[PDB]
C-alpha cells in the first residue's frame, strides 16, 4: 500500500487511498464479497450444526435457515422440517464460493495491477466517465434482474415456495398465475406507509410477491440495457455530482432506505417471513394471546360478544374505528393484523361471532397458544418475556433480532450517506480541506449577516 505523505489520507481513512486505484478498488470489493459469502456459509453451517429438529426454528435463534426454508427446502406441510441437507448444501457451496472470491480479492489487492485503464480498457474507468459508470451500472442491473428472474423460476418451476396462506397451516406451493397486473403491483409502491396500508410491507400473498419480482426483473433488465446503450442526459449531468464519493453516497442513501424497509418487513410482514419459521410478530402474538384467552373463556362457559371489560369497551370482541369486529383489549392497536389462523374465522364484517363460536380449529388454537407463549418480547441476554420476567426462558424472536440489527445498520448508513454526500459536494467544490484563508467567502459579501 501507500502512506500518508504520498496520498494525503491517514491510516484511519486508508481506503480513501484506493479511491483512484481501480485495481485495488476491485480487489477490496472482491475480498469483501468473499467475506459476505463467507459469513453466509459459515452461519449456515453453524446453524445447521446447532439445529434441533423437535423444536421450532424461532426458539433456536436461527435467521438463515428460516430464509432457506421460506423458499421451500427441506420443509413440509405445517412448517415442519423434513431435511437439513439442503441447508447444509447451501452453506458448503457458499463457503467454497467464498474461498474463490477471497482468493481473487486477495490477489488483486496484493499483486493485481494498480490501474486497469492503461491495460484493460473494458474494466478501466475514471469517475467522470459517466458513460462508463452507466455501463457498469447497466451490467449490475442485468445481474440483479437475472437474480430476480432466478427467484421467479425457483418459485414457478423449481419446487415453488412456502405459502403460509395455504389451507391447513401452509405448505410448499407451486406458484400458478402470478399477478402481473401493473395496477395492483404498483399500488403497493404508491401506497401510504401508515397503518391499514403499510406501503409494501402489507404484501399478503406470494402471487403479488412473484408478480412484483417478475416486474422488477424485467424492469432491471431493460434498465440495464438502457444504461449500457445510453448516456446521462444534460439535466442529470447538471443536477448530479460525478465523483466516486458521490456515487458511494447515493448507494449509501439507497441501502439505508433498504435497511429501514427490510427492518419493517421483518417486524410486520408474515407472508415473505412465515411465522412458522420466524416466530409470531408483535401484532400476531398479541392477537394470538387475545384469541387464546377468548377460546379459553368460551370453553369456560362465558359469553364472548357480551361480558364487557372494566371500561365498558369489551373484554373479548369489540369495534374497530372503521367498524369491523376486532379482538378486545389493547390488541385493538393491532386490529389490522392478518394471519393464517384468523382469516377462516373472519367474515365480511371482521371477526364473525358464529364462526368464532363453531368454526374453531384445534390447529389454530395450538398455533395461537404457541405464539402467545413465544411473543417477540425478550432481553439482549436472550431472556424470554418482558424486562420484569425471571431468567428462565431462553428465547428472543429472530424477527426482533433482524429488525433491531437492520434498523441500526440503516441508520448508520444514512449518517454515512450524509457524511459522504457532504464530502463529495465539498470535494467537487474545492473547499473540502478548509478555507483558503485569502478567499474567505464571508468577507466577500456584506455585513449584518
Amino acid at each position: 500500500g501507500r502512506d500518508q505523505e504520498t496520498t494525503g489520507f491517514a491510516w484511519w481513512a486508508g481506503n480513501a487511498r484506493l479511491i483512484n486505484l481501480s485495481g485495488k478498488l476491485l480487489g477490496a470489493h472482491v475480498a469483501h464479497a468473499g467475506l459476505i459469502v463467507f459469513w453466509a456459509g459459515a452461519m449456515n453451517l453453524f446453524e445447521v450444526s446447532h439445529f434441533v429438529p423437535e423444536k421450532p426454528m424461532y426458539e433456536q435463534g436461527l435467521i438463515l435457515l428460516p430464509h432457506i426454508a421460506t423458499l421451500g427446502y427441506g420443509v413440509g406441510p405445517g412448517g415442519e422440517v423434513l431435511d437439513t441437507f439442503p441447508y447444509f448444501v447451501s452453506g458448503v457451496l457458499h463457503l467454497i464460493s467464498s474461498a474463490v472470491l477471497g482468493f481473487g480479492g486477495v490477489y488483486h489487492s496484493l499483486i493485481g495491477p494498480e490501474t486497469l485503464e492503461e491495460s484493460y480498457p473494458f474494466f478501466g474507468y475514471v469517475w467522470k466517465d459517466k458513460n462508463k459508470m452507466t455501463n457498469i451500472l447497466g451490467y449490475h442491473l442485468i445481474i440483479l434482474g437475472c437474480g430476480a428472474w432466478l427467484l421467479v423460476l425457483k418459485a414457478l418451476y423449481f419446487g415453488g415456495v412456502y405459502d403460509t396462506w395455504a389451507p391447513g397451516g401452509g405448505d410448499v406451493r407451486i406458484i400458478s398465475n402470478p399477478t402481473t397486473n401493473a395496477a395492483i403491483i404498483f399500488g403497493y409502491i404508491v401506497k401510504s406507509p401508515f397503518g391499514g396500508d403499510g406501503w409494501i410491507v402489507s404484501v399478503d400473498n406470494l402471487e403479488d410477491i412473484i408478480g412484483g419480482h417478475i416486474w422488477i426483473g424485467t424492469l432491471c433488465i431493460l434498465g440495464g440495457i438502457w444504461h449500457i446503450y445510453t448516456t446521462p442526459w444534460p439535466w442529470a449531468r447538471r443536477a448530479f455530482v460525478w465523483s466516486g464519493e458521490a456515487y458511494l453516497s447515493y448507494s449509501l442513501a439507497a441501502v439505508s432506505l433498504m435497511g429501514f424497509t427490510a427492518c419493517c418487513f421483518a417486524w410486520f410482514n408474515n407472508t415473505a417471513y412465515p411465522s412458522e419459521f420466524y416466530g409470531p410478530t408483535g401484532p400476531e402474538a398479541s392477537q394470538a394471546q387475545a384469541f387464546t384467552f377468548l377460546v379459553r373463556d368460551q370453553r369456560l362457559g362465558a359469553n364472548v360478544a357480551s361480558a364487557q371489560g372494566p371500561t365498558g369497551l369489551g373484554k373479548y370482541l369489540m369495534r374497530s374505528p372503521t367498524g369491523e369486529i376486532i379482538f378486545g383489549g389493547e390488541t385493538m392497536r393491532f386490529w389490522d393484523f392478518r394471519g393464517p389462523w384468523v382469516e377462516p374465522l373472519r367474515g365480511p364484517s371482521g371477526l364473525d361471532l358464529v364462526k368464532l363460536k363453531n368454526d374453531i380449529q384445534p390447529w389454530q388454537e395450538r398455533r395461537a397458544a404457541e405464539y402467545m407463549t413465544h411473543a417477540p418480547l425478550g432481553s439482549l441476554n436472550s431472556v424470554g418475556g418482558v424486562a420484569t420476567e425471571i431468567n428462565a426462558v431462553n428465547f428472543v424472536s429472530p424477527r426482533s433480532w433482524l429488525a433491531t440489527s437492520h434498523f441500526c445498520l440503516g441508520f448508520f448508513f444514512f449518517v454515512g450517506h450524509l457524511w459522504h454526500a457532504g464530502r463529495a459536494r465539498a470535494a467537487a467544490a474545492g473547499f473540502e480541506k478548509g478555507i483558503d484563508r485569502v478567499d474567505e467567502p464571508v468577507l466577500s459579501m456584506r455585513p449584518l449577516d
Binding site: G74, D83, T84, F85, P86, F88, Y107, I111, Y157, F158
Partner: protein, 243 residues
C-alpha cells in the same frame, strides 16, 4: 479485422496475465496459427513442423466433432419432442436396424421417410465412399465435379491448394477472400471445433454415467436442477434425510 487478440505475440492465452507471463510460453507458439493460446502443460508441441502436423489432426477432429455433436443433439431432441425417429438416441442408434428393422430418416421440414437399405449395403457404400474421400484428402487429387462457387471445375484445381484449407470448390459462399476475415473465421472455426470435441466427450461420458441421451439430460436438468444432476445420479436411489 481485430486480429491483435488471436494472433501475434500479444494475444489471448489459456491463462491470464497474472497466472501466465509471456516468458514461459513455449518458444514454438508465436501466435501464427489459429487458436493459439500457448496451452502446453506437457511436452507434445516439440517444434513448428510437429505442431502443424498435429494441427492437421486437430482440425480434422474439430470438423468431425462439430457434425457429431449436431447429429447427436438434433435427432434425439426431435424424437423426444414427437418426431417418428425410432432411434434418436445416439448410443443405441446402430442397434435398432441390426436384424433388418431399417431406420427412418427425417428430412425436415418435410421428413419421415423409410430407408430401404440393409446394414451390409449401408456400410459397404460408406466404406467405398469415405475411403475414396480420405484418399482424395491425403493426395489432393479429384477427378471432376461441379460446385456452386467454381462451376465445372476440372482435375487441375486441387493442385497448389492449401492443405487443411482448400479454397474454391469447398467455398461456394466465399466470404474468405479477405485475409483478415479469413483468419478471424479460422480462429472461430478452431474454437467452435474445440468446444465440439469437448461436447462430444461430455456426451459419451454422460451417456455412460446416466444411460440416457444428452437431450434427455439437459431437459431433465432444466426440469429439476437440484433434484437431477451428477451427484443425484451418482447417489443411486433417494437419500435418508438428516432430520
Amino acid at each position: 479485422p481485430d486480429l491483435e487478440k488471436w494472433y501475434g505475440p500479444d494475444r489471448k492465452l489459456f491463462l491470464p496475465g497474472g497466472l501466465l507471463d509471456r516468458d514461459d510460453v513455449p518458444e514454438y507458439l508465436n501466435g501464427e496459427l489459429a487458436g493459439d493460446y500457448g496451452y502446453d502443460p506437457l511436452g507434445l508441441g516439440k517444434d513448428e513442423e510437429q505442431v502443424e502436423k498435429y494441427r492437421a489432426n486437430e482440425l480434422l477432429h474439430a470438423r468431425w466433432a462439430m457434425l457429431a455433436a449436431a447429429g447427436i443433439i438434433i435427432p434425439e431432441g426431435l424424437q423426444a419432442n414427437g418426431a417418428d425417429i425410432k432411434g434418436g438416441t445416439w448410443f443405441e442408434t446402430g442397434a435398432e436396424m441390426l436384424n433388418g428393422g431399417t431406420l427412418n430418416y427425417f428430412a425436415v421440414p418435410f421428413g419421415v421417410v423409410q430407408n430401404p437399405l440393409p446394414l451390409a449395403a449401408v456400410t459397404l457404400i460408406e466404406i467405398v465412399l469415405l475411403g475414396a474421400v480420405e484418399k482424395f484428402r491425403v493426395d489432393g487429387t479429384g477427378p471432376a465435379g461441379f460446385s456452386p462457387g467454381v462451376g465445372k471445375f476440372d482435375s487441375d484445381i486441387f493442385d497448389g491448394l492449401d492443405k487443411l484449407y482448400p479454397g474454391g470448390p469447398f467455398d461456394p459462399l466465399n466470404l474468405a477472400d479477405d485475409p483478415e476475415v479469413f483468419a478471424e473465421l479460422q480462429v472461430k472455426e478452431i474454437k467452435n471445433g474445440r468446444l465440439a470435441m469437448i461436447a462430444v466427450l461430455a456426451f459419451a461420458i454422460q451417456s455412460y454415467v446416466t444411460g440416457e441421451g444428452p437431450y434427455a439430460n439437459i431437459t431433465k436438468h432444466l426440469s429439476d436442477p437440484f433434484g437431477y444432476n451428477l451427484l443425484t445420479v451418482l447417489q443411486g436411489d433417494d437419500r435418508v434425510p438428516t432430520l
